Amino acid sequence: GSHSLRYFVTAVSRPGFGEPRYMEVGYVDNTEFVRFDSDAENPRYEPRARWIEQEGPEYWERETRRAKGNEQSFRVDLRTALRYYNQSAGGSHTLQWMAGCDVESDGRLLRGYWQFAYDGCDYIALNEDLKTWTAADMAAQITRRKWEQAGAAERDRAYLEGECVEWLRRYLKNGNATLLRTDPPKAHVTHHRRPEGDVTLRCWALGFYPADITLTWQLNGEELTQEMELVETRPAGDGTFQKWASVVVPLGKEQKYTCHVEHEGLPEPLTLRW
């Protein structure tokens, strides 16, 4: 299997409220474990998962330093983007950054990440080669040009290949009683007699972790995506997740429909009928 250590960073300008609100959120798989908030009572990197609470003082001050360093660059960045797009300085704007590594089961690096978006749209991304960029306007080609000239990728690619991996490696091994856990979904189908004379079959999956799951409906071995409504996987709030998928079936032909459930925690995929 594969795992990951991802950092989600946000900087939102606020001309009418003061300097930019800046935050950093760290994750190991679908598990937040660290957070930095500009607007806190005393901004510092804080633990959001008990397995990271086993880190020394150096760890919380080093990350706080790194977060404090980062925010300065983002304030700058925000203003540079203003110039690049010719926009007014009264409008709240956003710069997001996602950086991290997905490593395989052999320990090797499956993929390295380091991208940004400005106002919710892609801006500039470190290709999977971890050497060249990719932009999609003519303002981020300015950024591509700028950074390409400087040799940015090397240092970035050194963090994705080096430190990210070891720290993930350490986090994975130190959070094994949570991170390492696979809870299979409990599944069941409900029956909903519709006013139109037909039935809505609802396939549920509850209590699963990780959040990755696949739910499908079938008709005598036939994937019916036309007829299938599914909701976005959501959290129960306790570390587990939930999801459902529905299909409208003619009343009396229910027997013939099947819900298939694929999850890592399941020995074999489940197949359910009403």
């Binding site: 950093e24 790194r66 360093g69 983002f74 690049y84 710069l95 981020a140 950074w147 940015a152 963090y159």
Partner: peptide, 10 residues
Amino acid sequence: RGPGRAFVTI
């Protein structure tokens, strides 16, 4: 451990 901007701006 998180990534550093290294003061390389946009």
